[PDB]
Design an enzyme around this catalytic site. Structure first.
Site, PDB file in Angstrom:
ATOM      1  N   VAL A   3       0.761  -1.094   0.150  1.00 12.46           N
ATOM      2  CA  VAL A   3      -0.051   0.024  -0.078  1.00 12.46           C
ATOM      3  C   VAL A   3       0.828   1.125   0.096  1.00 12.46           C
ATOM      4  CG1 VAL A   3      -1.999  -0.977   0.990  1.00 12.46           C
ATOM      5  CG2 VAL A   3      -0.236  -0.274   2.513  1.00 12.46           C
ATOM      6  N   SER A  14       8.030   1.279   2.680  1.00 14.27           N
ATOM      7  CA  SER A  14       7.502  -0.089   2.655  1.00 14.27           C
ATOM      8  C   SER A  14       6.529  -0.719   3.274  1.00 14.27           C
ATOM      9  CB  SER A  14       8.852  -0.856   2.652  1.00 14.27           C
ATOM     10  OG  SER A  14       8.635  -2.237   1.963  1.00 14.27           O
ATOM     11  N   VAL A  15       5.258  -0.429   3.103  1.00 15.01           N
ATOM     12  CA  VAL A  15       4.084  -0.882   3.892  1.00 15.01           C
ATOM     13  C   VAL A  15       3.162  -1.655   3.371  1.00 15.01           C
ATOM     14  CG1 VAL A  15       2.232   0.141   5.459  1.00 15.01           C
ATOM     15  CG2 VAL A  15       4.422   1.273   5.243  1.00 15.01           C
ATOM     16  N   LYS A  23       4.795  -2.318   8.297  1.00 15.41           N
ATOM     17  CA  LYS A  23       5.714  -1.589   7.869  1.00 15.41           C
ATOM     18  C   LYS A  23       7.217  -2.410   8.234  1.00 15.41           C
ATOM     19  CE  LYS A  23       7.860   2.944   8.579  1.00 15.41           C
ATOM     20  NZ  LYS A  23       7.636   4.015   9.365  1.00 15.41           N
ATOM     21  N   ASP A  83       2.723   9.543  12.007  1.00 10.22           N
ATOM     22  CA  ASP A  83       4.162   9.860  11.779  1.00 10.22           C
ATOM     23  C   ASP A  83       4.936  10.301  13.109  1.00 10.22           C
ATOM     24  OD1 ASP A  83       3.332   9.845   8.740  1.00 10.22           O
ATOM     25  OD2 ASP A  83       5.013  10.681   8.725  1.00 10.22           O
TER      26      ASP A  83
HETATM   27  C1  FML Z   1      -2.545   3.155   3.810  1.00 10.37           C
HETATM   28  C2  FML Z   1      -2.375   4.200   4.598  1.00 10.37           C
HETATM   29  C3  FML Z   1      -3.242   5.484   4.373  1.00 10.37           C
HETATM   30  S1  FML Z   1      -3.045   6.656   4.947  1.00 10.37           S
HETATM   31  C4  FML Z   1      -4.095   6.883   6.362  1.00 10.37           C
HETATM   32  O1  FML Z   1      -1.783   6.962   5.358  1.00 10.37           O
HETATM   33  O2  FML Z   1      -3.572   8.057   4.143  1.00 10.37           O
HETATM   34  N1  FML Z   1      -3.035   3.852   6.067  1.00 10.37           N
HETATM   35  C5  FML Z   1      -2.199   3.439   7.148  1.00 10.37           C
HETATM   36  N2  FML Z   1      -3.005   2.812   8.338  1.00 10.37           N
HETATM   37  N3  FML Z   1      -1.813   2.792   9.107  1.00 10.37           N
HETATM   38  C6  FML Z   1      -0.750   3.149   8.465  1.00 10.37           C
HETATM   39  N4  FML Z   1       0.597   2.648   9.082  1.00 10.37           N
HETATM   40  C7  FML Z   1       1.551   3.457   8.275  1.00 10.37           C
HETATM   41  O3  FML Z   1       3.033   3.015   8.567  1.00 10.37           O
HETATM   42  C8  FML Z   1       3.098   2.587   9.832  1.00 10.37           C
HETATM   43  C9  FML Z   1       3.522   3.251  10.906  1.00 10.37           C
HETATM   44  C10 FML Z   1       3.733   2.678  12.359  1.00 10.37           C
HETATM   45  C11 FML Z   1       3.479   1.228  12.328  1.00 10.37           C
HETATM   46  F1  FML Z   1       3.732   0.567  13.308  1.00 10.37           F
HETATM   47  C12 FML Z   1       3.177   0.667  11.079  1.00 10.37           C
HETATM   48  C13 FML Z   1       3.007   1.100   9.885  1.00 10.37           C
HETATM   49  F2  FML Z   1       2.665   0.312   8.811  1.00 10.37           F
HETATM   50  N5  FML Z   1       1.447   3.780   6.926  1.00 10.37           N
HETATM   51  C14 FML Z   1       0.009   3.862   6.447  1.00 10.37           C
HETATM   52  C15 FML Z   1      -0.861   3.247   7.203  1.00 10.37           C
END
Ligand code: FML
Length: 342
Positions: free
Chosen positions: A27, A28-29, A44, A159
């Site tokens: 969706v 490196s995730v 991630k 973030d």
């Molecule tokens: C697709 C996206 C759309 S969006 C909401 O960014 O527009 N949605 C997400 N939902 N959760 C998420 N997490 C991460 O990065 C992380 C940060 C911390 C972690 F422990 C694990 C991760 F994968 N990135 C994206 C999303």
């Protein structure tokens, strides 16, 4: 005990994760389904987490931050794992959190939101920020894209970390539009209220459907900012520890603060009042998250007994100089010691 891991290539990257995580999709995730909890999750995989001191320290920083955050309106850590069976094999780190649907941009989409929507959305951001700030953590980069929301308008702050390069803060870019002036031009050692400036920008944008300060560059953005809030007074000028920046500021023709009621035509007078209290040039005088939550604009959401603060967050490591392997060993301890939430 150690779960069973399975291998799979995705982003031309070999992912090795516990069996519980299924249906991995880039969706490196990766989006995935956590069969253990029934939750849709985002997994991630950190890239080259220990390639340098800076990168290793950053990996440690992100993990520490995510492990600490336990609040409804803040991204939490559901799981953290490595395929490694020991420190010597340790090289990869995977972080797991809720799969959030969309960000705040996808919702605003060039349009005005109802006042009730704005109330609820800003309320949640401030609730999360009160929590974050109470642990002496500053987000530093709040913008609509770091704010994830679900169907029910429930919001989480994402973030926090990595930080933008000079190149990506250059020009007509949303990466700089929500940044407080003191940090955009490095006027001084900034504090927690930089985030409140960002909330004000976000809130105004939810109210008008338009970017508040869409500067074409740092200088253009400052002029946009100073047109609205007025040029700094003597008091603030003294606080600008940078002699160079102070000297440039004084080159600008003085301008008075504008009438916010005339800028935000039609808006709830309580929203206008809150905006004036968030969008103050002198960061010492900005309203805080805790104070903002008690503002009449949030009367229908405010609950002093349902706005928690955080456990103390020990960030002494930030001023610590360590070797790569030391940051690595610290990161490893944090992975191994992780305890999943209820
Ligand atoms: C697709 C996206 C759309 S969006 C909401 O960014 O527009 N949605 C997400 N939902 N959760 C998420 N997490 C991460 O990065 C992380 C940060 C911390 C972690 F422990 C694990 C991760 F994968 N990135 C994206 C999303």
């Amino acid at each position: 005990e150690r779960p069973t891991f399975y291998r799979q290539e995705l982003n031309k990257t070999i992912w090795e994760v516990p069996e519980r995580y299924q249906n991995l999709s880039p969706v490196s995730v990766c989006a995935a389904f956590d069969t253990k909890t029934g939750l849709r999750v985002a997994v991630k995989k950190l890239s080259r987490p220990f390639q340098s001191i800076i990168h290793a320290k950053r990996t440690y920083r992100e993990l520490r931050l995510l492990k600490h955050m336990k609040h409804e309106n803040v991204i939490g850590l559901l799981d953290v794992f490595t395929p490694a069976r020991s420190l010597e094999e340790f090289n990869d780190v995977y972080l797991v959190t809720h799969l959030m649907g969309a960000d705040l941009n996808n919702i605003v989409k060039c349009q005005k939101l109802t006042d009730d929507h704005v109330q609820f959305l800003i309320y949640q951001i401030l609730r999360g920020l009160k929590y974050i700030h109470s642990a002496d953590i500053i987000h530093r980069d709040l913008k609509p894209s770091n704010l994830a929301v679900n169907e029910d308008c429930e919001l989480k702050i994402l973030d926090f970390l990595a930080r933008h390069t000079d190149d990506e803060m250059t020009g007509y870019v949303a990466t700089r539009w929500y940044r407080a002036p003191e940090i955009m031009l490095n006027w001084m050692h900034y504090n927690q209220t930089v985030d409140i400036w960002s909330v004000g920008c976000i809130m105004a944008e939810l109210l008008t459907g338009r970017t508040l300060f869409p500067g074409t560059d740092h200088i253009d953005q400052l002029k946009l900012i100073l047109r609205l809030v007025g040029t700094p007074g003597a008091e603030l000028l003294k606080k600008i520890s940078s002699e160079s920046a102070r000297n440039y500021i004084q080159s600008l023709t003085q301008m008075p603060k504008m009438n916010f009621a005339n800028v935000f035509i039609g808006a709830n007078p309580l929203a206008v009042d809150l905006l004036e209290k968030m969008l103050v040039l002198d960061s010492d005088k900005r309203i805080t998250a805790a104070q903002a939550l008690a503002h009449a604009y949030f009367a229908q959401y405010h609950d002093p007994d349902d706005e928690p603060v955080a456990d103390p967050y020990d960030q002494s490591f930030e001023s610590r100089d360590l070797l790569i392997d030391e940051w690595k060993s610290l990161t490893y301890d944090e992975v191994i010691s992780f305890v999943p939430p209820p």
